[PDB]
Design a binder for this molecule. Structure first.
Ligand SMILES: CN(C)c1ccc(C(=C2C=CC(=[N+](C)C)C=C2)c2ccc(N(C)C)cc2)cc1
Lengths: 186, 186
């Protein structure tokens, strides 16, 4: 495909180098195409990026759907989501580029739109887990939205700032985290 | 002093033009030093910047050393420290040079090592809190080391991925988080 050959290399570079680190010039080189093609489908580099992000938040979200089954209680779904967060190949792998990107476009008021569109998607899994666990008497969360936001970010933190120690260390920490958080809800 | 002069000049250069932009050429001239001297104290730009980072960490600990006197109990110090990490970052001038660096040196073990002894220092503040809260029946963590790494990363996660909310909300969320986390020990 066309837009699909591009997107692949982009995601490739965005992760491997960083937002700016990677440029349109580059993309073309290992993607073969007119420096224009990238203009209809995607409005700009902000687009090509935001697109890749959109896909990823979809893929990962879907994977989770095809795996939460293995968790009978939401308490379990919570521990499980955070754990998978460490192994997946989606979204998280370019949280660094996102950080770059947000600090380099945060000044334009077009950020609070898409960078708030992917927001509700990212914190959704926790929404469901907490909301649904409320209906299932697993706990009693009054401020579900707050807690989802907290959870989502704290975890993204554990996932990101430990990207160097061994994977089993990460999983144990992540698990101790999950343990404590839930124990704090009630 | 001449070495301290370079560290000082380099710091302001980094703040004004970021990490990649700043050249050792400029650093050498504005501090009235030389390539030779710059090479002797630090060996590289990476090395020089990491050195800045260490000095900054020290001032931060020093600051905290004073600021905590305000918080009587360790439950309090926990709350305070997290809020402080959130607010000081809102306006930390090196914050951007940091990101531009960390996202360019996370695949090199040279920098991933020294940047680890650096994070451990940040994790110590927590360690102290928790060890001390123990000796006061404020709580009883049998894995102070682990809980500490968790606290550090959960919090930084909340600090790093939330820039799209008004500072008040951020503060609300971090304090809520501190409540949940501290409660997560009952
Ligand atoms: C986006 N990005 C590349 C980042 C984002 C945040 C940081 C961290 C940080 C830097 C400066 C601070 N102040 C001047 C107050 C406070 C915190 C930090 C994170 C984790 C950590 N630990 C693992 C313990 C220690 C520090 C570093 C890189």
């Amino acid at each position: 495909n066309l837009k699909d050959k591009i997107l692949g290399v982009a995601k490739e570079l965005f992760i491997k180098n960083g937002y700016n680190a990677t440029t349109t010039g580059e993309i073309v080189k290992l993607s073969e195409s007119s420096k224009g093609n990238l203009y209809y489908h995607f409005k700009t580099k902000e687009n090509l990026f935001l697109e890749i992000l959109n896909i990823e938040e979809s893929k990962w979200q879907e994977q989770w759907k095809k795996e939460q089954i293995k968790a009978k209680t939401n308490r379990e779904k919570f521990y499980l989501y955070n754990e998978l967060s460490l192994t997946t190949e989606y979204y998280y792998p370019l949280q660094n580029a996102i950080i770059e990107f947000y600090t380099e476009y945060y000044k334009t008021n077009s950020i609070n739109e898409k960078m708030n569109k992917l927001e509700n998607k990212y914190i959704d899994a926790y929404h469901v887990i907490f909301k649904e666990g409320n209906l299932n008497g697993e706990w009693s969360i009054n401020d579900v939205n707050a807690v989802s936001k907290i959870a989502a970010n704290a975890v993204n933190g554990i996932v990101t700032f430990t990207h160097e120690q061994n994977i089993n260390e990460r999983i144990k920490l992540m698990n101790k985290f999950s343990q404590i958080f839930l124990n704090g809800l009630s």
